[PDB]
Amino acid sequence: KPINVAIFGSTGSIGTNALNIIRECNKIENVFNVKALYVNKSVNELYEQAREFLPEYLCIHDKSVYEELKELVKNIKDYKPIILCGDEGMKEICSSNSIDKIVIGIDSFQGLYSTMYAIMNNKIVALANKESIVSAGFFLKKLLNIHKNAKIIPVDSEHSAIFQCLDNNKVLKTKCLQDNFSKINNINKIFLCSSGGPFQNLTMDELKNVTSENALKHPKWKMGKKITIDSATMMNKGLEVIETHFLFDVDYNDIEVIVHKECIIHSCVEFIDKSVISQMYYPDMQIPILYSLTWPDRIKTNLKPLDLAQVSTLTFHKPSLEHFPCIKLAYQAGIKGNFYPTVLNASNEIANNLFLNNKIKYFDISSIISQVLESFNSQKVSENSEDLMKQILQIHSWAKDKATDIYNKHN
Amino acid sequence: KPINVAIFGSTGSIGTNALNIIRECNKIENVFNVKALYVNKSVNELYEQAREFLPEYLCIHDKSVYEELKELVKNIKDYKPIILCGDEGMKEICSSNSIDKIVIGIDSFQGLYSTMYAIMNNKIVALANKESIVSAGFFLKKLLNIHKNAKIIPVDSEHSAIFQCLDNNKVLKTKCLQDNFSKINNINKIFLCSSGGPFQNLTMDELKNVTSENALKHPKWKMGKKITIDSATMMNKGLEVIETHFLFDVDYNDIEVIVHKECIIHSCVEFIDKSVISQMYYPDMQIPILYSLTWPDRIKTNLKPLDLAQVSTLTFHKPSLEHFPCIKLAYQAGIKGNFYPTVLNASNEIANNLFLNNKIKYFDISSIISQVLESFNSQKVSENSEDLMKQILQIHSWAKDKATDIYNKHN
Ligand SMILES: NC(=O)C1=CN([C@@H]2O[C@H](COP(=O)(O)OP(=O)(O)OC[C@H]3O[C@@H](n4cnc5c(N)ncnc54)[C@H](OP(=O)(O)O)[C@@H]3O)[C@@H](O)[C@H]2O)C=CC1
Ligand SMILES: NC(=O)C1=CN([C@@H]2O[C@H](COP(=O)(O)OP(=O)(O)OC[C@H]3O[C@@H](n4cnc5c(N)ncnc54)[C@H](OP(=O)(O)O)[C@@H]3O)[C@@H](O)[C@H]2O)C=CC1
Ligand SMILES: CCCCCCOc1cccc([C@H](SCC(=O)N(C)O)P(=O)(O)O)c1
Ligand SMILES: CCCCCCOc1cccc([C@H](SCC(=O)N(C)O)P(=O)(O)O)c1
Ligand SMILES: [Mn+2]
Ligand SMILES: [Mn+2]
């Protein structure tokens, strides 16, 4: 009586992690059917996944590699998947009755489109992509109010942690990204743990001159380049503060970022009695992904057991906002509300990418973002769902262009 | 629509802690009625509590201070409690329909009697007393199977922690101290945290010569002398391993003692997927006591918030069994089963008390306990509930006398 699951962004960090925990779990007993795989342009890698997982559906977003994908799949014998392309392909998969849960491991604002269609089709959405939440929080809430059986289950590790700390008895009275969620769950405050990233011990002088190469060495697993840069600036944690606010209905004043370099405590929830519950494991994404797919239950795994004596020491310190100004900008944008989160996310997409490509320096990232936020003026929020999406899209693109403009004017 | 609560052992460490969190909570809103107070012989202190809390019932176990208690209560005007005495008084309170929950803060094996009557009357039992569980685990289970609406809610801090880490959605399918509890809750393994006590850094040479005075300095709050000595020997943790086994149906091989000297993580549960959940706060008994009385809900308090940056470092190390042989003896007794836990608890009562009164040295505690365990032979467990209690009582007294004998023969 197994779980039918689609992986969106199957060839990326989250996607290959998700396929990995799926494969391992299926050895212990067959609980997952991989029904669909969706990627952007990694046609050869998708082919290879197809040969292993033989899903009912395959989709590739980039129209130019569509034929090529079809040609490659011909070489798998006794396998006749539905091979699809683009937004249309994505919508057809979201609307399949043979699909219960969708892992969203697509990066950036782009992730919002599949997230939205997943909800609209009343699916369980195992959402790793945080940019969607940060950019479109209010919209997603409204969609979730309309689509009663849709649910977002957080995969982002801290958010998974937070969610796992909750009493499902309370959780089942509501769902994530809903008014009153913190009241129903007796949540008072959140400790949002951070690795601190590679620059955590640098002086201001050293930070001035760090390069994307320095940033790209992230210890444990290979993540996408975008989150890796965000981890280096701690804008990733800035985004995750906003994500926390939206997922769990916690005020910004009740979200504390704490640098926990050992990455064993993944985050913590203080309840209204001041008791604190935390989730712990080695730094890893297999449990967040797995839990999203088994919630409200847990299944057996053969993961390496946490050994506290082996860990020995766990440390906690506040991040320096002077060293990590991206954190402050995120708090400011979150507290300001309106579409300030959209602008924050958009301007960061551009700043992140410029720094990645060695066009700007570290403190230029924050300086560009800060200037875009300063130039933005609050807009009335559309009451209508389709208009609100168009509004989100226009502000997102304006904010990207504005970021690019600031860059181009200082070049 | 408030909670009617009785405090057994009201004048002791747990009892005064329980009255304290009750008083504080009642300021935020009136949720608790203190319906009964029960003590052994602290007649003046009980009088004072009576004047403050004006409970419906008062009981004093020691018959010789009964009249005196009655005389003192005369001096409270417009207050006419039911003033009772002894086992009879205890049974009358347990059988009151005006009492929903009973905090058991009576020490030692003696605690079992009120625990048993509480269960027999279908009450919620907020059980701090662990000696009852260790000595009579199998019996309590059978009583709980018969009394469907009786429940033990753990107050012992690690056990509270463990219980708070569970999903109440699963918990409500069962109850503590029941077959299959770990299966229903997907529990795989327990990390049982320990302060390590005052002798944690002594050499073997230093341990040889420690005194009860050295032992009695326990940092944070004043606990009873008995648990304080047990903390010094780590027999307290030995007892808590057995308690864990019985409360949560976890095998001894899945219970790991870990010394966590900062006492922030109070204990941790590994689920079958290897995700770990822990409960955290400052070292304190107010939250364990409070949770026992509000479960399955939580209420607002004004307790001091946990501040992870302030804590800064958390450490974990395995205890040395050579330094703390009491731990090993407890594991051995637990694994052996039968009435070996009874004997362990009984012989420790005597050894603890001898060391308290400067009659023996530190390693004599373990040596006496070990010898009593070695002299014990498994007995067939009575099938009948009343006979099983008599059997528990006979073995408990035999084991005390045996401990005393070993002492007297080496003196
Ligand atoms: N890596 C991690 O451990 C964590 C990541 N996250 C979040 O998860 C998301 C994914 O990150 P990560 O896995 O690192 O990113 P990667 O760059 O590693 O992977 C991105 C994936 O998305 C696919 N993709 C891109 N555009 C499209 C599109 N239009 N349609 C379909 N698929 C598309 C890519 O396909 P292609 O291969 O064809 O380019 C690729 O499979 C991000 O939002 C990130 O913040 C959150 C927590 C941790
Ligand atoms: N202190 C703590 O923080 C913790 C304690 N515990 C457990 O809780 C229990 C209580 O410990 P603690 O509070 O330290 O002990 P204390 O010695 O501080 O208090 C014992 C209490 O029990 C009462 N008592 C003794 N015999 C009887 C009797 N026959 N009838 C009624 N009341 C009686 C005493 O009354 P009187 O004042 O008249 O002598 C006193 O009120 C123990 O089993 C201990 O292991 C567990 C976790 C932590
Ligand atoms: C074993 C030596 C430590 C290994 C460090 C592994 O990296 C981690 C570990 C945890 C968190 C993160 C963040 S980025 C990726 C992310 O968002 N995740 C995983 O949810 P952060 O830097 O923003 O806090 C990175
Ligand atoms: C602030 C500096 C640290 C303060 C230490 C406070 O003492 C504690 C703290 C926690 C545990 C205990 C044990 S004894 C008492 C007990 O059983 N409890 C509270 O449930 P242990 O020694 O057996 O682990 C004692
Ligand atoms: Mn994260
Ligand atoms: Mn304890």
**Residue A13 corresponds to which tokens in the numbers above?**
């960090």
Q: Is the dihedral of CA A304, A307, A313, A319 positive or negative?
A: positive
Q: Give all strands (DSSP E) within B23-150, no chain letters.
A: 32-39, 57-60, 82-85, 101-104, 124-127
Q: Which of B88, B106, B237 to mutate to test the pocket of ligand 2 (most atoms within 8 A of CB)?
A: B106
Pairing mode of beta strands A3-8, A151-154: unpaired
**What backbone torsions phi and psi does residue A52 show, to the nearest 5 degrees?**
-75, -50
**Which residue, chain included where needed, has tokens 């985050």?**
A267
Looking at the partner chain, which of B258, B278, B313 has a beta carbon nearest the beta carbon of A280?
B278
Q: Do A172 and B169 touch (CB under 8 A)?
A: yes
Q: Which of A192, A92, A102, A109 is nearest to A152 (CA)?
A: A102
Does B172 reach chain A within 8 Å, measured CB to CB? yes
Answer yes or no: are the C-beta atoms of A193 and A267 closer than 8 Å: yes
Distance, in Å, from the CA atom of A214 to the CA atom of A212, rounded to the nearest integer, reads 5
Does A169 reach chain B within 8 Å, measured CB to CB? yes
Q: Which of A162, A223, A20 is nearest to B275 (CA)?
A: A162
Output b/e per residue, B113-146; b: 16+ Cβ within 10 A: bbbbbbbbbebbbbbbbbbbbbbbbbbbbbbbee
- Which resolution, in Å, applies to this structure? 2.1
N-terminal to C-terminal alpha carbon distance within chain B: 60
Set out the domains of chain A in order of their start, with CATH numbers: 2-156 (3.40.50.720), 157-320 (no CATH), 321-411 (1.10.1740.10)
Pairing mode of beta strands A3-8, A32-39: parallel
* Alpha-carbon distance A190 to nearest alpha carbon in chain B (angstroms): 11
User: Which parts of B234-285 fold into alpha helices (H)?
Assistant: 235-248
Does A260 contact ligand 1 (Cβ within 6 A)?
Answer: no
Q: Which of A402, A332, A326, A396 is nearest to A364 (CA)?
A: A326
Distance, in Å, from the CA atom of B227 to the CA atom of B17, rounded to the nearest integer, reads 15
Pairing mode of beta strands A57-60, A32-39: parallel
Question: What are the CA-CA distances from residue B17 to residues B42, B49, B113, B161, B295 (Å)?
Answer: 16, 13, 22, 17, 18
Distance, in Å, from the CA atom of B162 to the CA atom of B151, rounded to the nearest integer, reads 16
Output b/e per residue, B399-411; b: 16+ Cβ within 10 A: bbebbbebbeeee
Q: Do A305 and B270 touch (CB under 8 A)?
A: yes
Q: Return all residues near B155 (Cβ < 8 A) that are at least 6 apart.
A: B14, B103, B104, B105, B126, B127, B128, B285, B288, B289, B292
* Cis amide linkage into residue B283, ω under 30° from 0: no
Q: Which of B170, B269, B298, B317 has the highest number of chain A CBs within 10 A, making it the mutation to test binding with A? A: B298
Q: Which of A296, A279, A243, A8 is nearest to A160 (CA)?
A: A279
Task: Find how far residue A360's CA is from the centre of its chain.
Answer: 25
Distance, in Å, from the CA atom of B308 to the CA atom of A396, rounded to the nearest integer, reads 36
Does B157 contact ligand 4 (Cβ within 6 A)?
Answer: yes
Q: Do B280 and A297 touch (CB under 8 A)?
A: no
Does B194 contact ligand 4 (Cβ within 6 A)?
Answer: yes
Q: Return all residues near A333 (Cβ < 8 A) that are at least 6 apart.
A: A242, A340, A341, A343, A344, A373
Distance B280 CA to ligand 2 centre (A): 24
